[PDB]
Amino acid sequence: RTQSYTNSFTRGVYYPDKVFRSSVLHSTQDLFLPFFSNVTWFHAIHNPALPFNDGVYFASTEKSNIIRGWIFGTTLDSKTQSLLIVNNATNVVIKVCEFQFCNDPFLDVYANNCTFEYVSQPFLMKNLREFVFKNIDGYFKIYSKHTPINLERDLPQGFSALEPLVDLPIGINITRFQTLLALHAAAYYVGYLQPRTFLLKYNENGTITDAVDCALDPLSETKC
Amino acid sequence: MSLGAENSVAYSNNSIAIPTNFTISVTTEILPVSMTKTSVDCTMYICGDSTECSNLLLQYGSFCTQLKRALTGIAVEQDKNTQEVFAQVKQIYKTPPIKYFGGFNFSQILPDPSKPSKRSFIEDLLFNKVTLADAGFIKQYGDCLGDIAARDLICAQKFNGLTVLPPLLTDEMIAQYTSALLAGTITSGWTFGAGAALQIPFAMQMAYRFNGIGVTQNVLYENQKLIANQFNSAIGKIQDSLSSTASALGKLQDVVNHNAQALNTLVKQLSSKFGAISSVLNDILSRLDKVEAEVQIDRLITGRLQSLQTYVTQQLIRAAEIRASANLAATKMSECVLGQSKRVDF
Amino acid sequence: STECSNLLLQYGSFCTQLKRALTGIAVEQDKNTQEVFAQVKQIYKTPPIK
Amino acid sequence: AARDLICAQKFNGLTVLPPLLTDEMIAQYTSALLAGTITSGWTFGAGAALQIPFAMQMAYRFNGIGVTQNVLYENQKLIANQFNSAIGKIQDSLSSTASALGKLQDVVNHNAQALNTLVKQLSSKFGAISSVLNDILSRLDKVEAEVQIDRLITGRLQSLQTYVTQQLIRAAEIRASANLAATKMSECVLGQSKRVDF
Amino acid sequence: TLKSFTVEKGIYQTSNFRVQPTESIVRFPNITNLCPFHEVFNATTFASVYAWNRKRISNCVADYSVIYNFAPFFAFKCYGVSPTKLNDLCFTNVYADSFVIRGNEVSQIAPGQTGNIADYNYKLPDDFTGCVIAWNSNKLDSKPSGNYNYLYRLLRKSKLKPFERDISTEIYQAGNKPCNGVAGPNCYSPLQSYGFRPTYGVGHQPYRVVVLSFELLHAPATVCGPKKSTNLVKNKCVNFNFNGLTGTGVLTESNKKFLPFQQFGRDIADTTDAVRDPQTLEILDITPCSFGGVSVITPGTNTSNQVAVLYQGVNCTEVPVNVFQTRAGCLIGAEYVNNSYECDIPIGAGICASYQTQSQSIIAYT
Numbered sequence A: 001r002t003q004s005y006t007n008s009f010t011r012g013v014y015y016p017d018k019v020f021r022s023s024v025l026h027s028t029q030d031l032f033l034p035f036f037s038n039v040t041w042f043h044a045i046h047n048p049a050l051p052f053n054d055g056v057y058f059a060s061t062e063k064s065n066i067i068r069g070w071i072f073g074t075t076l077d078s079k080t081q082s083l084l085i086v087n088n089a090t091n092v093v094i095k096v097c098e099f100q101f102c103n104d105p106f107l108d109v110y111a112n113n114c115t116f117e118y119v120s121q122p123f124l125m126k127n128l129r130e131f132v133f134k135n136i137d138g139y140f141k142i143y144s145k146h147t148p149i150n151l152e153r154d155l156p157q158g159f160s161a162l163e164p165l166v167d168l169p170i171g172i173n174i175t176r177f178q179t180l181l182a183l184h185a186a187a188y189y190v191g192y193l194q195p196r197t198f199l200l201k202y203n204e205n206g207t208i209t210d211a212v213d214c215a216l217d218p219l220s221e222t223k224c
Numbered sequence B: 001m002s003l004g005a006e007n008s009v010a011y012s013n014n015s016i017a018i019p020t021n022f023t024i025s026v027t028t029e030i031l032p033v034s035m036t037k038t039s040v041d042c043t044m045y046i047c048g049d050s051t052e053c054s055n056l057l058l059q060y061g062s063f064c065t066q067l068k069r070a071l072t073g074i075a076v077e078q079d080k081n082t083q084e085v086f087a088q089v090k091q092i093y094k095t096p097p098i099k100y101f102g103g104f105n106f107s108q109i110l111p112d113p114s115k116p117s118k119r120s121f122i123e124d125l126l127f128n129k130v131t132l133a134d135a136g137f138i139k140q141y142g143d144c145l146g147d148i149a150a151r152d153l154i155c156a157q158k159f160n161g162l163t164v165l166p167p168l169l170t171d172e173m174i175a176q177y178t179s180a181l182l183a184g185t186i187t188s189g190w191t192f193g194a195g196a197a198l199q200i201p202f203a204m205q206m207a208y209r210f211n212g213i214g215v216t217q218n219v220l221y222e223n224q225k226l227i228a229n230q231f232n233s234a235i236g237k238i239q240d241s242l243s244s245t246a247s248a249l250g251k252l253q254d255v256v257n258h259n260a261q262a263l264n265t266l267v268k269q270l271s272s273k274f275g276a277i278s279s280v281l282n283d284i285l286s287r288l289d290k291v292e293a294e295v296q297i298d299r300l301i302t303g304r305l306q307s308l309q310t311y312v313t314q315q316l317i318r319a320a321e322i323r324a325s326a327n328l329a330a331t332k333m334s335e336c337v338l339g340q341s342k343r344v345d346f
Numbered sequence C: 001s002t003e004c005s006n007l008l009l010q011y012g013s014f015c016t017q018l019k020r021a022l023t024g025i026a027v028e029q030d031k032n033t034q035e036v037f038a039q040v041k042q043i044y045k046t047p048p049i050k
Numbered sequence D: 001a002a003r004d005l006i007c008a009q010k011f012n013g014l015t016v017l018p019p020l021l022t023d024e025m026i027a028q029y030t031s032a033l034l035a036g037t038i039t040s041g042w043t044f045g046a047g048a049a050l051q052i053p054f055a056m057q058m059a060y061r062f063n064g065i066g067v068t069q070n071v072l073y074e075n076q077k078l079i080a081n082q083f084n085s086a087i088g089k090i091q092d093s094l095s096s097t098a099s100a101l102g103k104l105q106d107v108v109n110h111n112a113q114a115l116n117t118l119v120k121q122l123s124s125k126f127g128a129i130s131s132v133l134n135d136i137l138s139r140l141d142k143v144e145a146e147v148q149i150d151r152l153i154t155g156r157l158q159s160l161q162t163y164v165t166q167q168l169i170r171a172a173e174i175r176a177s178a179n180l181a182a183t184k185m186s187e188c189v190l191g192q193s194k195r196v197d198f
Numbered sequence E: 001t002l003k004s005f006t007v008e009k010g011i012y013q014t015s016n017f018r019v020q021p022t023e024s025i026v027r028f029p030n031i032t033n034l035c036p037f038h039e040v041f042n043a044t045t046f047a048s049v050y051a052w053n054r055k056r057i058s059n060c061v062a063d064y065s066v067i068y069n070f071a072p073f074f075a076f077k078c079y080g081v082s083p084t085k086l087n088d089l090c091f092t093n094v095y096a097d098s099f100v101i102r103g104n105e106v107s108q109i110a111p112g113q114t115g116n117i118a119d120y121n122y123k124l125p126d127d128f129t130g131c132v133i134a135w136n137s138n139k140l141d142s143k144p145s146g147n148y149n150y151l152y153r154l155l156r157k158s159k160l161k162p163f164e165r166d167i168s169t170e171i172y173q174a175g176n177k178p179c180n181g182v183a184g185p186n187c188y189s190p191l192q193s194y195g196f197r198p199t200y201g202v203g204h205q206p207y208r209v210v211v212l213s214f215e216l217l218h219a220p221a222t223v224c225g226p227k228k229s230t231n232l233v234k235n236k237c238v239n240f241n242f243n244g245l246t247g248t249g250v251l252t253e254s255n256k257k258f259l260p261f262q263q264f265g266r267d268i269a270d271t272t273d274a275v276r277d278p279q280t281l282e283i284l285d286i287t288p289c290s291f292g293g294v295s296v297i298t299p300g301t302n303t304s305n306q307v308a309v310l311y312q313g314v315n316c317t318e319v320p321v322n323v324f325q326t327r328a329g330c331l332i333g334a335e336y337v338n339n340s341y342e343c344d345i346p347i348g349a350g351i352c353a354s355y356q357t358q359s360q361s362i363i364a365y366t
C-alpha cells in the first residue's frame, strides 16, 4: 500500500457522555485526537498490521462502499476469538470469531469458543465518514459521524461532532487491527488518540460547535 | 519603562517665572460607594429541601446564624454608605427657571423633564456606560418558572438559595439629591453648607473663588467671557470623552464584576464531590443505607460549609474596602462641593 | 504525586480563588508604589550650581 | 553550605515575585520631586514648574505661617545654620540607632514568618499515619491511602486558606498606610499644609 | 429567632416559605420478564478462574429478595450500593461473573488489590460498583482423591487489565534459552490444579463466587424490578421518581432538542434540569416549586403586638405556604398611604413603614 502524511485540521471531536448540556463550556479529560496532528493517508492497491494505540480515528471517503470492516485483535489467524466487523449492507456482525484469513484479509464477494454475538442496524450506510474506536476497562466503544464535504483533497476544516452508536464489553487486549476491503480503491485516513484535556462549547441547541485543546500552544492553555 | 520626559528648570539667584495667562480645566474623578446586597439560605444551598441533610446540619451548631448576621450587617452597611455620601443636604433646592449664570452653561449637568427619571445628559451617559450584570433586585421567579431558550445564571442562583436585595434609595432619589446639591452650589455657593442658603450672583461667587486661590478679583471681571468659554469647552470635551472612550468607568465595573463572579463560583462549588461518591444528594440518599449515606452527606456538608464561609469572609473584606472608599467619597463631597479646598492635589 | 492530584481535583476550585486572591494582592502592591511615588509628570533635574 | 530556608520555600511551591519598579526608578522619582521642590517651590505640583530663588521661596513659606517676610531676610544666616545643624543631626541619629525604621522591618518580618509557618505545616500529620505522602502511598492499599491523603489534603488546604486570609487583611492595612503616604506626599511635599500635626 | 421575649423596632429576616408537594409520581419502563438468577446462582458446575463465566442480564424485572433463597451465603458485600436499596433505584445492565476460588483468595476479589488472582486471573476495576457473593462449596467441589478439574495460572509476562480473560496456554520462559514447546529446564506450564480435599483446613476450602456488576444509568434503563408505575401529572409541585432518581418539583412540557441517544439534562451546578419519560418518549423540564424569604416588620413589644409580613421577591399571587406590591417583594398587613414621612423602618426600593395614629396601625409610605 501507499502511505502519505496529512494534517488532521482540528477534526475528530466526539460527545463525551450522553447528557444534554446547552449554552455552557464544559471541560473533559478523555482519549481525544489532538489538534493539527499527523494522520496517515493510505491508498490500497496491494498488508502489514496497523498498531492499535489507545484508540483509532478512522476516516473514509468511499462512495461505492468498498470499505467494509475491521479485524481488531492480536493474532488474526484464527486460534482466538479476537474481534470482527462484517457488513452485509442490512446488518452488522460483531461475532467474535474467525473466518480463517491469511495475512492479506480480503473478502470474496461475487463456533470455536464463541463468547459474544451481537446483531444491530446497518453500520456503513462529499461522503466523509468518521469513526472512533476505543478500549477502556474491557469496554469497546464506537463513535461515528457522516459529513458532506465540498472537494475531496484532504481532511476539511470545521467542527463535526461524533455521536456514539455501539458499546461492547469484550475485545480483550486489542493491539493490532486490519481493515477489510472487498473486491468484486481505498483512500482511508488513520489517526491515533491520546489522553488529552478539551474545552467544549455547547450552543443553545446542545451541539458541540467549537473546542479548545489545552496542550497545543500556550494561547490554548490560557484559554483553558 | 519610561518614567517621563527629561526636564531641566533654569534656576538662578535672581530669576523668577510668572504666568501671564490661564486655563480652566474640568477633570473627572470616579469613586465607588456601595456594592450589591446579598442573602444566602443555608438549607436551600447545602441541602436543597432534604430532611436528612437538615437534621445532620442541625448538629453543626450556629454557623449559619452568624453567616446570616454577617451578611445582614454588610447589607445594612451598604445603605448606610449611600446615605452618608449623598444625603447630606437638608432641603431640596431648585434652580430658577431662567438659566443664565453669568455665561456658564450648566445644561449638561442639570436635569430635564423629558425623560421620567430626571437625570442629566452626563448622568445618562454614565448610567449607559456601566453594564449591570442583571442583579436580582428585579422580580424574576415568574420569569425563571417559565423556561425560555436556555437556563440563566441568575435563575440558577435563585434556585440554589442566593438572593440579591434591592437598595433602599432608588436611582431617581439619588438623582434628586444630586440635583439639589447642584442647585445649592450654583445658586448660593458655600453658604448652604453652613446653614441657610444665601443667594449671590455667579460672577460674584466666582470672584470669591478666585480671591480664595490668591488671584485678585479684577482678573475675573476683565476676563469673564474667556473664562465662560473655557468652562463650556471643557464641559464639551468631557461630553466627547464620555461618548467616545468606554474604559474610564471600569472601577465601578469591578464593583459589578466581582459581585457577579464570586456568586457564580458559589454555584460551581455545588458541582464538587469533596471526597464523596456523588455530588447529588438524592443519589447518595438512594444508593446507600443510613450510615454510609450519613458519612457521604457529612463530607458534602463540610465542603459546602467551607465554601460558604470563604465566600462570607471575602465579602467582609470587600465591604471594608468599599466602606473606606465611601468615606473618602463623603469627605470629598463635603469638602470639594460644599466649600473650597486649599489642600493641594485634593 | 498523581494520586494526590486526582483526589485534589475533586475538591473544586479552592486553588483557583486562592491564586486569584494572591494575584490581586500582588497587583495592588505595585499600584500602591505607583500611586505613592509616581506623582510628577517630568523628571526634573537640579542645576550644576549648588 | 546547608539547606537554606528560601530554598525549602522554593522547593515546596512558594515564590516571591519582584516588584515592577526597581529601586533606581524610585530613587529617580524621589530625586525629581526634590529637584522640583527645591528649584520651583509648590508651582511644579500645580502646572508648569516656575523657577524662584530659595530665599524668596522661604519668605513665601514664612508668610504662609503668620510671620512677615522681613524676619527671614534679616536673619537668613541663622535659619540657614539652624537647618544645616538639624539636617546634620539626622545622619548622626541614623548612623547609631537601629530602632527608627522598625515599622518597615515589621513589613519584612511578618512576610518572612508566615511563609516559615507555611513550611512547618508540611510536617504535621492531621490525624493520618504519617506526614510523608509517599510513605502513605507505599504503605497502604488504594482505599486506606485515599482516606489518609484526604486527611492530609484537608489539613494543608486549611493551612493555605489561613495564610491567604491573613495576607488579605495585611494587604488592606498596607493599602490604608499607602493611601496615607500618598496624601502626605501630595500635601506636604508639593505644597504647604495648615493642618495641625499633619 | 431572636431568642428573646421582647423585640425592638425594625425589620427581621424571620424564615423561608416553600410550597409543599402534594402527589407522588413513579415512572418505570413497562417490562414484564423475570431475570434468570436461577440459572446463575445454582448450576451443575462453575467454570475455572482463568475462564470465568460472564452472563449478561437485561430487559427483565430484577428481584433481589429471591437471591438469599438460592445460596447459603453470609456476606452480600457491595461496594457502590447497599443490598437493602437494590430494589428502589435501577440500572442499565447487570453482568454476572461466576467462578470458584480458594478461601484465602476471597479477599482478593476487591477493587485496588494485588496478589495472584487479582493480578493474573481476574482483576476488578478500581471504580467498581456492584456486589460480590461468595459461599462455601466443600460439599460440591471436593473429592477425597482430589478435585483437579479447576485450574489457575501461576504467572504471566504482564499484568492483567480490569475485566479481561486469558484462555491460550503458552509455555513460559525465564531465560535466554528458548523452550521451543518443550517443558524442560526453566520451562513451566502456567496452569495448575487446585487439588481440593475434604481433609484440608477451613481456609483452603473451595468457594463459589458470583460478582454482580451493575453499570450505571446513562442509556435507557432495561433491567430493574417491581416498582408500580404511577400516572404522570404536570404543572404541580410533586415528588417524582424517574427511573430511580427522586426529586421534588414541577414537570413542564418543553421544546428542548435532545439527540436520540440522550436521556437527561444537567445544570451548571450539575443537578437535573430536564428528564425523559421512560414510557412515552417525551422531554420534561423540572423546576423547583415556589419558595422565598419571609421578613417581619414590627414596632417594639412595649408599643404593640401588630406586625406586617414582607414576602421577598415574589409576584404574590402565590402567597400561602391589606396587600401592597413593592419592588422588594410584597407587603401583607400594612396599608399604603399617599403621603411622605421620614423613614422609620426601611423595607425596599424607596418604601418605608411606621406605626402611626392614622386607632393605631402600621402604615407604609414612600
Ligand SMILES: *[C@@H]1O[C@H](CO)[C@@H](O[C@@H]2O[C@H](CO)[C@@H](O)[C@H](O)[C@H]2NC(C)=O)[C@H](O)[C@H]1NC(C)=O
Binding pocket: B020, B021, B022, B023, B226, B229, B230
Ligand atoms: C489667553 O489664552 C486664551 C486661550 O487659552 C486666548 O484666547 C484665544 O485668543 C486667540 C487669539 O490669539 C483667539 O483666536 C481664540 O479664539 C481665543 N480663545 C478663546 C477661548 O477665547 C487669549 O488670547 C490669551 N490671552 C493672552 C493675553 O495671551
Ligand SMILES: *[C@@H]1O[C@H](CO)[C@@H](O)[C@H](O)[C@H]1NC(C)=O
Binding pocket: A005, A006, A007, A037, A038
Ligand atoms: C508527519 O511525519 C512525517 C514523518 O517523516 C513528516 O515528514 C511530516 O512532515 C509530518 N507532518 C506534519 C509535521 O505535519
Ligand SMILES: *[C@@H]1O[C@H](CO)[C@@H](O)[C@H](O)[C@H]1NC(C)=O
Binding pocket: A203, A204, A205
Ligand atoms: C437551533 O436549531 C434551530 C432549528 O433549525 C435553528 O433555527 C437555530 O438557528 C439553531 N440555533 C443555533 C444555530 O444557534
Ligand SMILES: *[C@@H]1O[C@H](CO)[C@@H](O)[C@H](O)[C@H]1NC(C)=O
Binding pocket: B012, B013, B014, C049
Ligand atoms: C548667584 O548666581 C549667579 C549666577 O549663577 C552668580 O553669578 C552669583 O555669584 C551667585 N551668588 C552667590 C552669592 O553665589
Ligand SMILES: *[C@@H]1O[C@H](CO)[C@@H](O)[C@H](O)[C@H]1NC(C)=O
Binding pocket: B105, B107, B108
Ligand atoms: C448652551 O446654552 C444654550 C442656552 O443658553 C443652550 O441652547 C445650549 O444647548 C447649551 N450648550 C450645550 C452644549 O448644551
Ligand SMILES: *[C@@H]1O[C@H](CO)[C@@H](O)[C@H](O)[C@H]1NC(C)=O
Binding pocket: E030, E031, E279, E280
Ligand atoms: C410500553 O408503553 C408504550 C406506550 O404506551 C408502548 O408503545 C409499548 O409497546 C409498551 N411496551 C410493552 C412491552 O408493552
Ligand SMILES: *[C@@H]1O[C@H](CO)[C@@H](O)[C@H](O)[C@H]1NC(C)=O
Binding pocket: E042, E043, E044, E069, E070, E071
Ligand atoms: C439449582 O438448580 C439445580 C438444577 O436443577 C437444582 O438441582 C438445585 O436444587 C437448585 N438449587 C436450589 C437451591 O433449588
Ligand SMILES: *[C@@H]1O[C@H](CO)[C@@H](O)[C@H](O)[C@H]1NC(C)=O
Binding pocket: B142, E315, E317, E325
Ligand atoms: C407581576 O407583577 C406586575 C406588577 O404589578 C403585574 O403587572 C403582573 O400582572 C404580575 N404578574 C402576574 C400576576 O402573573
